[PDB]
Amino acid sequence: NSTAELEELLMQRSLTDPQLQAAAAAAADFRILPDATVIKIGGQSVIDRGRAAVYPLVDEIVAARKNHKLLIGTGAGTRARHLYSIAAGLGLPAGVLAQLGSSVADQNAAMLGQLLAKHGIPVVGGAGLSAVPLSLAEVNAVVFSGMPPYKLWMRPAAEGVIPPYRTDAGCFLLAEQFGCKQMIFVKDEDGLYTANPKTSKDATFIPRISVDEMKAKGLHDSILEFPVLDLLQSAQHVREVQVVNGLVPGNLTRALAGEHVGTIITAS
């Protein structure tokens, strides 16, 4: 097999070719940032709450950055919902909406980023090859914007103009591509339940579940965006995620230390 097999197939076959797809699917796997963890700070879950929920989690982040490398994503929250209600009633397609809610993720990133400035952790631009914020044993952290940059090219849903891929997927997708050891979602609920947490019937806390079981239980989209689960079965580097309750202090640092607090969702 040695010098190069594909110097034939990449030149002479279409990229939809199954004979080509398999040979690319067996190639070296490189992890760009294997020892870094990505977090999502929910826009509605955490940041739209303000000082009460945010400051404790801010104190946590500084404490973790020493022993951990942290990639901090932000969420949209209620302001993105208003933009969707206004725009969705006008009839504008999902592509227009995607860039509307990206602003709100940037706003939260700006706000969140300014609380952490004195510690030396910036908001990211022209980064992703920029490992200096993450590389410095003093900082080892960054703040970025949860939303994926699809704006007009956003894949729409089966029905409705609300963008299917949002700060969950944007944060997840950044971990998957960069090799991150973990992916943590920080939200307002203890994790996944078998009914709607605020109004439920028997609701049984699910400490662990796999995707196909989630699809089973009608849970496709309870805590995380539904495409993110299908993205979880396709992910090559991060085969599982964790949903923790930020409203309960210490849970962020715990799961960063590797404990199982909250729900963990597995691809297989």
Partner: protein, 244 residues
Amino acid sequence: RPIRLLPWLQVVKIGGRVMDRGADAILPLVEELRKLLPEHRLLILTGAGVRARHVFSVGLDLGLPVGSLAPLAASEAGQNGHILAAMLASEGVSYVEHPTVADQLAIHLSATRAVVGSAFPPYHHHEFPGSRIPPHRADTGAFLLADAFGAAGLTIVENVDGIYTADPNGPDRGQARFLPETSATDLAKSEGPLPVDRALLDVMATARHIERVQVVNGLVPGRLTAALRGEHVGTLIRTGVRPA
């Protein structure tokens, strides 16, 4: 149902493999595009072609994930875009970046008759996992863009007459029969290499506006012109959308 943002736009897409053939393929295409400028309001999007396969081979030998490979392939579509815009420059044409295609197109197409861009979407590091070859390529990006704007149609310009039962240049080249008309669903279930992305068939399922896309051969002049008038010169791919 959403609204059509630029209902009067015709979005064309020029394959990356067409550009790889040099002046012989391109120069007849420019002269045909100069002819079209007064007739339609055109957004012309370039694919990547072979050079992207070279970044893949190199990028694959280094182990880089698909999300690193996507922005590097989109870079070539940007390079194919710069060439076509340059040959058409004296006609008022220039290449515009993703943010201008996303935000300012309606102004710039009001200023001039046409513009050039890269069909590749700005997915860059957020490209989907599962495949080591980026799922969303020029064909997929050009439809996504055409179908958001509400454009009158998307036309796909390649080096083969249309879609066949197998690569008409490939190992089965003899055994390949042409398919003058096909549906996105029939294509999504039939396997083999295709001139279009498997992602084009997936995005067509959620398509709100564009009911058809034609794949025509840009190596035969006049087929682009005729396709843009609705004459059937190539493969008509139905997206499963109904008109009204």
